[PDB]
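Q: May I have one protein plus its fold?
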Amino acid sequence: SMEQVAMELRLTELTRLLRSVLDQLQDKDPARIFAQPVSLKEVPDYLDHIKHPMDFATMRKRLEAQGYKNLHEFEEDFDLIIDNCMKYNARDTVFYRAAVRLRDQGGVVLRQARREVDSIG
């Protein structure tokens, strides 16, 4: 149908918006602490601590599979990256501190992307 295509044009443009957002969030992690999943060879107990791991490459695979239906689902995944880190790592660590910074810097980008998605449907 013609409706299914127009929806697909929107999903595709939402995917195009979220990719820009994702690159902007990732530029706020220049140390690349959050680029890749936490290694289970190196942190073998990780899954006993963290039930839903998340990272920027895993967000990218889902993004390019047009697997984010809306901004909320995308934001949930971003928040996981931060929240997982802040639980697993103590306050006085480079890792915990890198998440606090990513969160604070991300907030601005996510504020404007909420307005852009509402604004352009």
User: Anything to note?
Assistant: The two ends are 21 Å apart (CA to CA).
